[PDB]
Amino acid sequence: SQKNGIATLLQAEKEAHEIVSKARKYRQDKLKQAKTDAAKEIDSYKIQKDKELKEF
Amino acid sequence: MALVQFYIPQEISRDSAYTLGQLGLVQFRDLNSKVRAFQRTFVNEIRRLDNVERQYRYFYSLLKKHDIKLYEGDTDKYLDGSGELYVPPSGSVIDDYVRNASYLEERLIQMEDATDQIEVQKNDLEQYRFILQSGDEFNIAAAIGASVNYVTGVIARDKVATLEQILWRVLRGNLFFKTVEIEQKNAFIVFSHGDLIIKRIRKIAESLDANLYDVDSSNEGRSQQLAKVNKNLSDLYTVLKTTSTTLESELYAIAKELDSWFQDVTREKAIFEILNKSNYDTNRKILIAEGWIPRDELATLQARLGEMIARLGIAQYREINAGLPTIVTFPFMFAIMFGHGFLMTLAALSLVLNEKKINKMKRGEIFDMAFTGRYIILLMGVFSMYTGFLYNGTENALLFSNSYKMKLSILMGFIHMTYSYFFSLANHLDIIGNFIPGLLFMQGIFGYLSVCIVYKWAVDWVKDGKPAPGLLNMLINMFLSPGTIDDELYPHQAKVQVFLLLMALVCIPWLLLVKPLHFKFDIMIHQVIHTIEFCLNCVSHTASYLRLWALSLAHAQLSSVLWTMTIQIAFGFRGFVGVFMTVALFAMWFALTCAVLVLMEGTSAMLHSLRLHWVESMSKPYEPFAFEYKDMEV
Amino acid sequence: LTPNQVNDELNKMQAFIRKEAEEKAKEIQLKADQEYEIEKTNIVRNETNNID
Amino acid sequence: PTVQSLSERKYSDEELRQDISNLKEILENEYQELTSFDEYVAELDSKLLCWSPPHVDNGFWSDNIDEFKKDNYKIFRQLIELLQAKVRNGDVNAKQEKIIIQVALNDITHVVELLPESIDVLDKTGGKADIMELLNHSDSRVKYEALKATQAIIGYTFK
């Protein structure tokens, strides 16, 4: 099994590279949704300010 | 215990893995550079190689600034004590060496520049001090004023001042003074002229010799300037002494650290080159092996250089063939060309004790290659005493010793030819064939010639031969089949030539026919080229082996002529004339005899050329000569 | 030369490579989560100040 | 220096190398963006001299050489008066005085080399006679800095 450990190690290294690329894509997805969180929070804060203005 | 990394192609992994594993390597697993994720190639290896080159340039700049010679030697193997003392087996960092060497290089450069500027200023003030005292002597009354025209100047000697006086007299007439004063070397000169011609005398002094002006000094604030020049010359000697003491004290502690850091940076550069840190090394070498080496087999791993793998952790056959028979056949056949061997045994015996200091001294060009092949010169020099003392049966005249010396080289070369054919026939181990049929015609012709040569020297009574025998037996044979004997043959007597010609004629067709048959368990031109090469080398070996009696007879005649023509003249005229004439004749005789023996020893490379060219074909280049010296080392 | 050493070294190298890849993926996910959190917090603070 | 030396050596995970490269430019740019004249005036006024990355460069003393002249070179006379005042009171062959003496003697060499008019303020203040006494004692690093300042003053004192 001398010529099999490099063939299994290449697939394990490619699986580790795809596992790192999945975490990089998840970090890019969280960085994409990070602006959508505050953009969804500003419209929730302006309606909270409008109730405080209409109440007074 | 220690991590080892090697790189080589994927064609010799079994031979390099067996040789590396046979010296203490265990857990050897062949891998590549793309199957891992913690040791992949990148630009960080090229930046580490550039940082190693900057550390080597900083070590070369620190070695050049240190005033010591540049170390051109390197020892990265863990076998020797110098390689282990200059390169530890543990890991190293290039940032600690570069950061530990940048401040020493900058401090050494600033100390060298300040020491050179302080030495130049102290040399200028010390050179101007005696000129200022000599000019001030001839307190101050007319040397610091403005009402008297005085011109000082420093010169090398009066001979250079004579050309300045001739140029000043040719370009200014007789309007100056020519004086010379001896100084500590320097020359004190003084000129006299008008007070309004200082511009023409200074401008004429500008195109003149050594720089002297109307006021030769850098300080004139005090009266006189000799006290301030003596104070600056007394402080510059203290500043230059402090700079030289700080430079010597700082340079005395970092002598071996530059060579050890250069060897560690060379081993780190070899590990970076083995790691494939470049972009063009990922297609040349694709096999990378790793293993675990203990703390006791690392010194044994440097005993062999390897075939193509670089044994650097954090003709490359293992046992055969590398030229193992050249260590015995080389010095024994080479020693027969030469007691003349006693001086070679003494000079070769001095190289045993002088091997340690002579290995690092590097004295001369022939002493380096002689020191590298010290074992071959010791064995060949020790074996030369037997053949040298044996010559000068006995040698008395020509036509007597040549009858035995002629057949002695053929009888001695026949066993080397038979051993060289049996050594090639034993090798190459289903895959047999093409070697058992060869060496049958030459074994029959040379066997019948050597048998008649050995039987010829035993035949007294008359059943023998004067012409030669042996040479006339093989010379007359192969021409006439129906002969009886010519000459001195046994009661056989005609079946030997018929069996020799019948066995020699069948060797031609049976040679090429056995090659394709033995392979079946491009060969057409290889069979005819091997048959023609074997047929040419078979007569070429016995034809080339006859130089031994010629060289031995030439050197023995050239030594015995001077010795026999010097001993008789040295032994006559007893008294002081025998001691002075015998000593003066024996000194010039032994002086030319040692140069003649060194000339014969230098001219004895025909056995190495014939054994390297002709002997290498039947056995299996310069691989056997290096393998003979490397065989005794490992 | 031995067959067990290549399997043991290949298994240890594969386990160390898998653990290093999992640790690098976890560190990349934590850094991306922290950068997304600060990137949301800055615009949330600016929009909250302007709305205030 | 450890971030600059560690920034050259790279490995896998190049996002951490970009984080170290972004941290090195913010670290060097954050401290290098300050004024050298205010930091040198506050450091000389505080009576505490220490070796720094921007304190051994000729660019900091080059811009502070023209701004230090306010009254007869009072900045170099104050630094030489603090270096000689540390030699007079607070005796030498100690660990505390050697750092400020080596820092002031190493800092005086750049101002004396860049400006040739500092020999008059140094000789008038008295740092020339006190600079020669530091070479004969211990602290051979600070004695090497005093040999560099004495070599710089000796280079301009005689050509």
mmCIF file with all atom_site columns, all heavy atoms in Angstrom, chain D residues 112 116 151-159, unseen atoms left out:
data_model
loop_
_atom_site.group_PDB
_atom_site.id
_atom_site.type_symbol
_atom_site.label_atom_id
_atom_site.label_alt_id
_atom_site.label_comp_id
_atom_site.label_asym_id
_atom_site.label_entity_id
_atom_site.label_seq_id
_atom_site.pdbx_PDB_ins_code
_atom_site.Cartn_x
_atom_site.Cartn_y
_atom_site.Cartn_z
_atom_site.occupancy
_atom_site.B_iso_or_equiv
_atom_site.pdbx_formal_charge
_atom_site.auth_seq_id
_atom_site.auth_comp_id
_atom_site.auth_asym_id
_atom_site.auth_atom_id
_atom_site.pdbx_PDB_model_num
ATOM 1  N N  . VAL D 1 112 ? 24.806 66.270 15.210 1.00 0.00 ? 112 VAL D N  1
ATOM 2  C CA . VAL D 1 112 ? 26.135 66.824 14.978 1.00 0.00 ? 112 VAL D CA 1
ATOM 3  C C  . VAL D 1 112 ? 26.609 66.513 13.563 1.00 0.00 ? 112 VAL D C  1
ATOM 4  O O  . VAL D 1 112 ? 27.373 67.281 12.966 1.00 0.00 ? 112 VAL D O  1
ATOM 5  N N  . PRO D 1 116 ? 26.484 71.138 10.892 1.00 0.00 ? 116 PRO D N  1
ATOM 6  C CA . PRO D 1 116 ? 27.864 71.437 11.303 1.00 0.00 ? 116 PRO D CA 1
ATOM 7  C C  . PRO D 1 116 ? 27.984 72.584 12.290 1.00 0.00 ? 116 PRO D C  1
ATOM 8  O O  . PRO D 1 116 ? 29.086 72.827 12.797 1.00 0.00 ? 116 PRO D O  1
ATOM 9  N N  . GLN D 1 151 ? 33.649 60.990 17.262 1.00 0.00 ? 151 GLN D N  1
ATOM 10 C CA . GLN D 1 151 ? 34.178 60.905 15.905 1.00 0.00 ? 151 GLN D CA 1
ATOM 11 C C  . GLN D 1 151 ? 33.458 61.875 14.977 1.00 0.00 ? 151 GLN D C  1
ATOM 12 O O  . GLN D 1 151 ? 34.049 62.383 14.017 1.00 0.00 ? 151 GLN D O  1
ATOM 13 N N  . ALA D 1 152 ? 32.178 62.141 15.248 1.00 0.00 ? 152 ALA D N  1
ATOM 14 C CA . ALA D 1 152 ? 31.438 63.112 14.448 1.00 0.00 ? 152 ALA D CA 1
ATOM 15 C C  . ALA D 1 152 ? 31.871 64.536 14.771 1.00 0.00 ? 152 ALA D C  1
ATOM 16 O O  . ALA D 1 152 ? 31.938 65.389 13.878 1.00 0.00 ? 152 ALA D O  1
ATOM 17 N N  . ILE D 1 153 ? 32.170 64.813 16.042 1.00 0.00 ? 153 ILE D N  1
ATOM 18 C CA . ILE D 1 153 ? 32.664 66.136 16.419 1.00 0.00 ? 153 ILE D CA 1
ATOM 19 C C  . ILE D 1 153 ? 34.120 66.296 15.997 1.00 0.00 ? 153 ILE D C  1
ATOM 20 O O  . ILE D 1 153 ? 34.581 67.403 15.695 1.00 0.00 ? 153 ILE D O  1
ATOM 21 N N  . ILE D 1 154 ? 34.864 65.188 15.969 1.00 0.00 ? 154 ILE D N  1
ATOM 22 C CA . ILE D 1 154 ? 36.263 65.240 15.553 1.00 0.00 ? 154 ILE D CA 1
ATOM 23 C C  . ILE D 1 154 ? 36.367 65.359 14.038 1.00 0.00 ? 154 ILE D C  1
ATOM 24 O O  . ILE D 1 154 ? 37.363 65.866 13.506 1.00 0.00 ? 154 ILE D O  1
ATOM 25 N N  . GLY D 1 155 ? 35.347 64.885 13.319 1.00 0.00 ? 155 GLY D N  1
ATOM 26 C CA . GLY D 1 155 ? 35.348 65.027 11.873 1.00 0.00 ? 155 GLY D CA 1
ATOM 27 C C  . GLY D 1 155 ? 35.076 66.451 11.427 1.00 0.00 ? 155 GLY D C  1
ATOM 28 O O  . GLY D 1 155 ? 35.617 66.911 10.418 1.00 0.00 ? 155 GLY D O  1
ATOM 29 N N  . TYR D 1 156 ? 34.233 67.168 12.172 1.00 0.00 ? 156 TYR D N  1
ATOM 30 C CA . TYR D 1 156 ? 33.960 68.565 11.856 1.00 0.00 ? 156 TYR D CA 1
ATOM 31 C C  . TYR D 1 156 ? 34.966 69.505 12.508 1.00 0.00 ? 156 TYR D C  1
ATOM 32 O O  . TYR D 1 156 ? 35.122 70.646 12.058 1.00 0.00 ? 156 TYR D O  1
ATOM 33 N N  . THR D 1 157 ? 35.650 69.051 13.561 1.00 0.00 ? 157 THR D N  1
ATOM 34 C CA . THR D 1 157 ? 36.642 69.895 14.218 1.00 0.00 ? 157 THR D CA 1
ATOM 35 C C  . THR D 1 157 ? 37.926 69.995 13.406 1.00 0.00 ? 157 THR D C  1
ATOM 36 O O  . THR D 1 157 ? 38.656 70.986 13.524 1.00 0.00 ? 157 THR D O  1
ATOM 37 N N  . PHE D 1 158 ? 38.218 68.992 12.581 1.00 0.00 ? 158 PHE D N  1
ATOM 38 C CA . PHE D 1 158 ? 39.422 68.996 11.761 1.00 0.00 ? 158 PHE D CA 1
ATOM 39 C C  . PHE D 1 158 ? 39.160 68.164 10.516 1.00 0.00 ? 158 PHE D C  1
ATOM 40 O O  . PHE D 1 158 ? 38.632 67.051 10.611 1.00 0.00 ? 158 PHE D O  1
ATOM 41 N N  . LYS D 1 159 ? 39.528 68.702 9.358  1.00 0.00 ? 159 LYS D N  1
ATOM 42 C CA . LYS D 1 159 ? 39.329 68.007 8.091  1.00 0.00 ? 159 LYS D CA 1
ATOM 43 C C  . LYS D 1 159 ? 40.653 67.504 7.528  1.00 0.00 ? 159 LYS D C  1
#
